[model samples]
Target chain A: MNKTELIKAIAQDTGLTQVSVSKMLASFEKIITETVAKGDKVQLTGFLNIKPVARQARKGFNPQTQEALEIAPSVGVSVKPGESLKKAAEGLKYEDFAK
Target chain B: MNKTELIKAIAQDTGLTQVSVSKMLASFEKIITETVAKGDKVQLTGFLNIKPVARQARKGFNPQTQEALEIAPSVGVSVKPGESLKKAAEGLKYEDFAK
Candidate 1:
């Protein structure tokens, strides 16, 4: 589902009002963005760990031109899904989704 | 950072009590896990989308025995980081990390 649906689910499941749930979710998003931007990782145990990885400048090919070019180094966020989440996703019983 | 550290950060940033922060985090984890297990996606827009992907059974090599074996179909969680998060991660100002 999308953001709105997820927020509604959170509200319903946690017995929190929709506004509260929305604020909480917004806070979560803001915190994650700020943390990763500061080069720190966010580890949501049993779900995932979001972290930044750096790549060094390197030689690369320009596929369009078929020519070599220098590829500038950059950083990106990487999500390493936690073990529990991994297991749940892989072992989900078909019947569970029937409803 | 680890789970405890993350909770501490959330508490500090959100003006929420540590206990409350912990509960909210746990709830978040539970919701995401449950949703994905039911084969539904959780899209935290502008951050990441967590979803399940199915793989079909296939053939694979058994390197030690030098024989082919069947690779069973399986499912896994995939995290696709959002565009805004990607930019924040890549364009993090160095000064922000300097404490």
Candidate 2:
């Protein structure tokens, strides 16, 4: 489902209009994006957690060129699925995908 | 920050009552959890995507016992950050964390 579909679903379930739900979702995204960019963490209780992680400069060689070089330090986001989402995905077998 | 703080922020930003925002959040979580559990994907365009991923059976070892073992197939949720979220974290240097 895309954002519109999600908004509609939420609106239906919560008895809110799509407009209100849309505004709320945009706010949620904006807040989280700003918080994570500032190196803070956001936890949706038993749903998920998002945080910023830093990578240190390191020595490495390019696989294609085989030349040694320094890899620059950078930052990235780490998203961990929380208990509710984890429990939701825990029951499947790999074989289920093939069917 | 936790869910309550998040809800309060959303309520403030969207001009929604805390009670209404809380209901919307619960509905959002419920919908996503059910959709993912049933093998569907949810994408908040340019922010994030959530989906279920399957793991195949494999051979493994108990590190403490050094005994052979069979790792059972299982499922997990993959949460990938989208363009907006990725861009938010791209500007930080690793050294920023040290300050």
Candidate 3:
């Protein structure tokens, strides 16, 4: 299922129009990104939490040409799906998604 | 920031009632969880993607007993935040969140 499909399901379930759902979702993404960027975390209890993680500057080499490179420090968002979703994902077979 | 806060922000931006936004958000969580558990992926372009990840069973020891423990194989959902969210999280200092 993609966003369009998901939006349809949400709209149907909540008795909201697709346009309202779409707008809300867009606003959600925008707020989350902006909030975490400002050093605050978004915590949705029993579902997921998103926060910023700090990364240190380091050195690295290009795998293709074997050239060294300087890597600068950065922050990245981390999403931790909480209990409900994690439980839903339980008991899956490794072979199902194996290479 | 949390879900309540986020809902307020979204409601402000979209001119949707808080109750409606809240209901839609609940529906979103339910739909996404159910869909991914059924082995389908939810891809929101430039925002995030969530999918089922098959995890292999592993052996571990109980901290208290110091005995071997057999862990069952499981499926876990993996959420990957997209380019826009990630770019917004960049350039953070390691010291800012350090001990």
Per-residue CA lDDT of model 3 for B1-99, tens digit only, reads 665666665677665555455666666566566556666787764656777775545557777666866455456676666655556656332336543
DockQ of 3: 0.43
Provide the lDDT at A44 for model 1.
78
The collision pairs in model 2 are none
TM-score (chain B) for model 1? 0.59
Candidate with more favorable, higher DockQ: 1 or 3:
3
- iRMS of each prediction: 4.3, 3.4, 4.1
Better of 2 and 3 by TM-score: 2
- Give the whole-model CA lDDT for all candidates, comma-separated: 0.60, 0.63, 0.61
Per-candidate TM-scores read: 0.69, 0.71, 0.71
Tell me which of candidates 1 and 2 scores higher on TM-score. 2
Q: Arrange candidates by lDDT, descending.
A: 2, 3, 1
**Lowest lDDT 10-mer window, candidate 2 chain A?**
A89-98
Rank list by DockQ: 2, 3, 1
- Which CAPRI level is candidate 3? acceptable
